[PDB]
Amino acid sequence: GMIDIHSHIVFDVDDGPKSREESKALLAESYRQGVRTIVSTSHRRKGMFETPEEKIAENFLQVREIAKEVASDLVIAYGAEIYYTPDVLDKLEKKRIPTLNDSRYALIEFSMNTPYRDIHSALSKILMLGITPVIAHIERYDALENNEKRVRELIDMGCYTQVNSSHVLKPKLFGERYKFMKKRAQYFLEQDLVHVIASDMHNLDGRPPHMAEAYDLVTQKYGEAKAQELFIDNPRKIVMDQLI
Ligand SMILES: [Mn+2]
Ligand SMILES: [Mn+2]
Ligand SMILES: [Mn+2]
């Protein structure tokens, strides 16, 4: 019954699945791990991911149909991962790019090196539209690294935070390629700065979901209540347009 609010499951629109078959296999693995609702958040990024909205929506509806071949109770909701450039304010205000399941929440991302002042300003402007930012993979941002302050100041302003399931996991004994991101994620969890864990799944090679492993790890380290909050209860509130 996990609810995954960050995913690249739509074929032929971004760096996610290339085909219907690949979308189906990604959905199947997500379901196998215990996920029961997935929010599609394919990339909207000026200068990198600019597939027309009409094509994303059309391919999304096909993916929702494919999900029925996986399981009758797998819920597929619409959404977007919005890389912040100033044109997105008008797109959001005019409802031309999607929020998460038509709620007040929008999934927002920045670059690794985006300065804190720019993150703060962008999020403030989005809040002024009546939209609540969910900050995508906060472990990515140099500006927030080891910085409980900064993260809390963003939260206190009205934002919520999301960390990728892959970075929740322990560093592996061999072949660890993402040690620093794991370490950042570990700090955010330890300081209780994380509202949601989501997969950011793209495929079944380099970027599969790690939702079941992350759920078990959080359960072990922080208890079942925190695990339920991060993987089920907070993401459900977002999907249902309820405040956290
Ligand atoms: Mn991507
Ligand atoms: Mn991203
Ligand atoms: Mn993503």
Side-chain angles (χ1 to χ4, degrees), residues 33 49 59 71 102 144 155 184 223 239:
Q33 292 183 19
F49 296 116
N59 285 185
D102 209 32
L144 303 180
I155 292 170
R184 287 175 174 190
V239 163

Side-chain angles (χ1 to χ4, degrees), residues 139 176-185:
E139 68 272 28
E176 180 57 54
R177 311 185 70 172
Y178 296 93
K179 170 194 42 191
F180 308 106
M181 304 274 274
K182 286 183 169 180
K183 184 229 60 166
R184 287 175 174 190

Side-chain angles (χ1 to χ4, degrees), residues 6 8 43 45 81 83 107-110 136-137 140-141 162 164 200 202 207:
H6 184 162
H8 301 266
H43 284 293
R45 177 166 175 174
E81 179 180 16
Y83 180 93
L107 182 70
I108 308 304
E109 76 167 326
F110 302 91
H137 46 53
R140 177 163 308 188
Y141 312 117
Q162 179 261 311
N164 289 355
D200 195 16
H202 286 67
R207 291 201 269 185

Side-chain angles (χ1 to χ4, degrees), residues 9-12 16-25 63 66:
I9 57 175
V10 182
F11 57 87
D12 190 36
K18 292 169 57 200
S19 69
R20 292 158 175 86
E21 290 60 35
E22 284 182 1
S23 290
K24 187 182 176 168
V63 169
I66 290 162

Side-chain angles (χ1 to χ4, degrees), residues 95-164:
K95 285 214 160 206
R96 289 179 193 176
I97 40 76
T99 55
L100 304 177
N101 195 42
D102 209 32
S103 73
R104 75 195 85 188
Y105 295 97
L107 182 70
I108 308 304
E109 76 167 326
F110 302 91
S111 295
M112 179 176 299
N113 68 355
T114 303
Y116 178 71
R117 69 186 74 173
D118 295 339
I119 295 172
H120 183 105
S121 178
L123 298 175
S124 177
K125 293 169 176 293
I126 293 170
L127 284 155
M128 294 184 323
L129 300 178
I131 291 161
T132 297
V134 182
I135 306 165
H137 46 53
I138 55 166
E139 68 272 28
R140 177 163 308 188
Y141 312 117
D142 295 344
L144 303 180
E145 175 189 331
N146 284 330
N147 210 130
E148 172 161 7
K149 183 169 71 172
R150 285 185 168 169
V151 176
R152 289 192 177 282
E153 289 173 350
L154 292 176
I155 292 170
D156 289 352
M157 182 171 70
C159 305
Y160 297 86
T161 60
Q162 179 261 311
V163 165
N164 289 355

Side-chain angles (χ1 to χ4, degrees), residues 38-81:
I38 301 162
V39 184
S40 172
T41 62
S42 294
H43 284 293
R44 274 64 166 188
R45 177 166 175 174
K46 191 189 188 300
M48 182 175 314
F49 296 116
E50 298 205 40
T51 300
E53 289 299 318
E54 189 163 327
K55 172 168 173 185
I56 303 171
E58 178 182 340
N59 285 185
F60 168 80
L61 292 174
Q62 294 181 47
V63 169
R64 173 180 279 166
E65 294 306 295
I66 290 162
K68 297 171 179 176
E69 299 171 20
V70 174
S72 291
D73 66 340
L74 176 51
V75 176
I76 308 297
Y78 197 48
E81 179 180 16

